[PDB]
């Protein structure tokens, strides 16, 4: 109807520490409405390589300065059909879920996942979870929010679990599976 | 001939180990249940692990 | 009720789960209607 002749398109922008790049257009009437919308883009679409097209990233809008909608990181998730092909019969998936905080004050919840190459015993299986916790917290001490995130989606934390844990049982495919921020620093 | 089921016989021995930082000579058990330490100096000689100990000195005989 | 598994066999009869329920109703009527 004529209600559509009153719209206006806005350009959404990725965060700063991914490099401000346009990711889609968005229609709205007045800016006060386009203020908490969430966009989903893959990692192949920012710094495009053809390997990491199964990592999805969520950006949440927070600012409208004149036809430019700047975003903020919100979460990360691997794709269903991807982690659906790693859990085969005779492998013993191992799953950990942890709550952390970084130097700035961002409190987060990260969810690792390891997959053994063969069925193992449950006492070998909680030792690997201990390893995961002990190198996740430790990592989350001397790193700010912008660096913990930047290397979670890259694979720099998983490529260390894969090195410590292998001296309990040889594995295949360690990775981080989901991130979701919870709060911000109360200050600033 | 002479099956094990009649007259059973053990599988574990008595050794004549010889200390390292003490020179002392002793007799110990092969499947110990405690922590065999030297009788003058105190350094361990064997360790308890499940079935058979894992000795830590020089052997002279099997007795 | 001390029942016997020969009667759950259904060949030339009706179901026993339903004979039980009908014996119970008579054991009630003999009790209330001056079973004292």
């Amino acid at each position: 109807k004529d209600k559509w002749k009153l719209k206006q398109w806005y350009v959404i922008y990725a965060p700063d520490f991914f490099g401000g790049v346009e990711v889609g257009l968005t229609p709205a009437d007045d800016p006060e409405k386009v203020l908490n919308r969430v966009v989903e883009v893959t990692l192949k679409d920012i710094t495009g390589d053809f390997l990491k097209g199964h990592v999805k990233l969520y950006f949440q809008v927070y600012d409208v300065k004149g036809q430019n909608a700047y975003t903020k990181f919100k979460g990360m998730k691997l794709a269903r059909s991807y982690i659906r092909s790693l859990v085969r019969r005779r492998t013993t998936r191992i799953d950990g879920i942890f709550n952390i905080t970084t130097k700035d004050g961002y409190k987060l919840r990260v969810m690792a996942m390891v997959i053994a190459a063969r069925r193992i015993q449950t006492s070998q299986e909680r030792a690997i979870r201990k390893i995961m916790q002990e190198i996740i917290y430790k990592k989350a001490e001397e790193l700010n929010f912008k660096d913990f995130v930047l290397e979670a989606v890259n694979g720099k934390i998983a490529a260390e679990i894969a090195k410590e844990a292998k001296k309990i049982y040889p594995l295949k495919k360690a990775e981080i599976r989901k991130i979701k921020v919870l709060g911000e620093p109360e200050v600033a | 001939a002479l099956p094990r089921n009649v007259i059973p016989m053990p599988r574990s021995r008595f050794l004549r180990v010889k200390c390292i930082d003490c020179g002392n000579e002793q007799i110990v058990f092969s499947h110990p249940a405690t922590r065999v330490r030297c009788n003058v100096c105190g350094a361990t000689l064997v360790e308890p692990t499940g079935g058979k100990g894992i000795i830590r000195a020089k052997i002279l005989e099997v007795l | 009720m001390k029942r016997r598994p020969r009667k759950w066999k259904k060949k030339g009869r009706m179901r026993w789960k339903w004979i039980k329920k009908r014996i119970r109703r008579l054991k009630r009527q003999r009790k209330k209607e001056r079973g004292l």
Binding site: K7, V11, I12, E22, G24, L25, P27, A79, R80 | - | -
Partner: protein, 128 residues
């Protein structure tokens, strides 16, 4: 830039099908059509032909408002009910790109519980 994309939500069950074209966030819809808005009787409301027609009429209306391509999200009732998309899903997907649109990536987003709540029938099912 001048490149405008969007998302196509396609809901398919054993009794109907719904095609829904929204912008890149899903917060402003552009065109929404169903299976019973096209056929007249209740019988083949789920048929693949009705899906073929609904997707055609939805793409016609969205292409002129400025859309050029669409990503695809296919859904079943899921949850506490059936977990497999019915007969019209692929027939709406194959007749969406035929009408001029492009197609980006494709995925299924059926809801799956990690041991959720209890379904109908009761200990014996539908004894039809």
């Amino acid at each position: 830039k001048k490149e405008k994309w969007g998302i196509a939500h396609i809901y398919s069950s054993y009794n109907n099908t719904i095609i829904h074209i929204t912008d890149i966030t899903g917060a402003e819809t552009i065109s929404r059509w169903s299976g019973g808005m096209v056929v007249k009787a209740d019988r083949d409301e789920p048929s693949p032909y009705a899906a073929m027609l609904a997707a055609r009429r939805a793409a016609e209306e969205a292409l002129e408002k400025g859309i050029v391509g669409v990503h695809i999200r296919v859904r079943a009732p899921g949850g506490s009910k059936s977990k497999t998309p019915g007969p019209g899903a692929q027939a709406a997907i194959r007749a969406l790109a035929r009408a001029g649109l492009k197609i980006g990536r494709v995925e299924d987003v059926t809801p799956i519980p990690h041991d959720g709540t209890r379904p109908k029938g009761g200990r014996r099912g539908r004894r039809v």
